[PDB]
Amino acid sequence: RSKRSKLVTLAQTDKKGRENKERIFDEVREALDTYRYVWVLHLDDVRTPVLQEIRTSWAGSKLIMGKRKVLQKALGEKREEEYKENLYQLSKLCSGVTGLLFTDEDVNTVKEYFKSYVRSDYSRPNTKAPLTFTIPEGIVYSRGGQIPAEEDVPMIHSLEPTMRNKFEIPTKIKAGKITIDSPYLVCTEGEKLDVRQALILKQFGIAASEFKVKVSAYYDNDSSTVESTNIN
Amino acid sequence: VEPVVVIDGKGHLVGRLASVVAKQLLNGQKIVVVRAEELNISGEFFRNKLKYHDFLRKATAFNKTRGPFHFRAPSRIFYKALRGMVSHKTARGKAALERLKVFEGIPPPYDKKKRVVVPQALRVLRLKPGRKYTTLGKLSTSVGWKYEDVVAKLEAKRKVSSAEYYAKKRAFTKKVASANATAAESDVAKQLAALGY
């Protein structure tokens, strides 16, 4: 007794368990014999609608269904475990998000697509904002004045506690509208975005950051090359 | 072995100390208890304080004067515990109790005389480590004792002038050790070591 009382809210969904991993484990091995070229992606940050657009942009190319550490075991971390020759060296070169592309498209097609592809994204933590913005020194609005304040809508009172406490800014409620006494500088160029700084920009919807999937290593089922035309 | 044993009640248990002293009293050995205000009782303060009030309730239903009365001094509390362990209302019990003396602090001339302790009644050697305990000083004051400040105030004066006596004694023993040390290894000293002395 005297233990944390576990809490859970009843929902239709349920945990997948290890059986899901087993299907994941075999999926990578099957792809090595089906597709021609193998690529590993390092998209440390993702957006699901953007991922679907990348996934749906083509049919032959397939993003492997699996988990990073499971991918390593599926690919084989040793010469005695590799499903194909020279694959074990390739597996140990990727870490983090489960980025990996299996496709039959030519290498020139792969590099051209990723190099040209680019999309906007929110200022994620650990990054530096490419711009600076100061909140108006009076009543604040939904967009913070980035768009004309006349067109902007006043911030809803319900979000005041988040700004006052979570973001730590000295906000207060005045007749249902949040007000500040000074033009608080949310962030500036060169500063590494803390979670609070990123959240403030995220709350305002300022997608002042670019996003593109970075790929490092390339592999083939017969050439077995470990060339890495890394693009950042 | 000692005509008059002086026992320091500090750090002792009332039940264990009283029982040990009670048997000696029945054996004809005179005993004196000092520093009773620093005596300790097992259990946290609330239990000891609560139990004392419960006993006070049953003094007498109709008239307290025509019955028992509650003594607030810490020494009397120890005496009450020891009294129940002696065959009172008898010649042997009454005579034995006359051999016992209890005072708060160390009133003279006991201050100038050695005082012993009972190893089988110390809180350190009996109470489990980390367990709470109650001190008679707080308990006695909570039940109406009005001399805790006086005892504490003048006990410091007792503590003072005693280190000075020990300081003189410590210096004197240092001279004795040097005198004994230099006299060591002599013909008489070497022969003494053979016989164990």
Binding site: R164, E168, P170 | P129, G130
Partner: protein
């Protein structure tokens, strides 16, 4: 299971120094010094390499083991206080009656005075503990800042200020006058 020995580690930054004996703990550093008494917790200390202090309990039970971690937290708080320092910000907002907060030095105690709280004629005095220093925030609307080395003194003083401003049997929703801890940041944050 009655752990034979449970140990905890406390990292000591080079900027501070700690001396340990019978359980009176002293911490010395750039911001000052702190003292704490742990004779009632029966833990054993040990200096490893002057950068890590080990606290261990032998034959500690579940009730005793739980107290072992508290020593690290209290010692860690002292280390952080002497290095970083604790700053408790508060704001004395009001609806209609302006809350006036001032400091008086009756008998040299530097008591904090609160006046005109919800129109009450009574003047509320809040004592200031040793070590904690009061500094009114500049250009910040009705903000008061509490700073000090000891968490207990700084935190307790903030609690007393908020507690003594309780509304006497009134609708909490309709009445907002009071003092609240807006932030619990450090003095030299980085």
């Amino acid at each position: 299971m009655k752990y034979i020995q449970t140990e905890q580690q406390i990292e000591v930054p080079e900027g501070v120094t700690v001396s340990i004996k019978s359980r009176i703990v002293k911490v010395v550093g750039p911001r000052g010094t702190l003292t704490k008494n742990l004779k009632h917790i029966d833990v054993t200390f040990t200096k490893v390499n002057n950068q890590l202090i080990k606290v261990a309990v032998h034959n500690g039970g579940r009730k005793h083991v739980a107290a072992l971690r508290t020593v690290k937290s209290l010692v860690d708080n002292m280390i952080t206080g002497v290095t970083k320092g604790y700053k408790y910000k508060m704001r004395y907002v009001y609806a209609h009656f302006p809350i006036n907060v001032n400091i008086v030095e009756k008998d040299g105690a530097k008591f904090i005075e609160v006046r005109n709280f919800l129109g009450d004629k009574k003047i509320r005095n809040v004592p200031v503990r040793d070590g904690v220093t009061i500094e009114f925030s500049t250009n910040v609307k009705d903000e008061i800042v509490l700073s000090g080395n000891s968490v207990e003194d700084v935190s307790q003083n903030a609690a007393d200020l908020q507690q003594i401003c309780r509304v006497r049997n009134k609708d909490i929703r309709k009445f907002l006058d009071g003092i609240y801890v807006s932030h619990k940041g450090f003095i030299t944050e980085d």
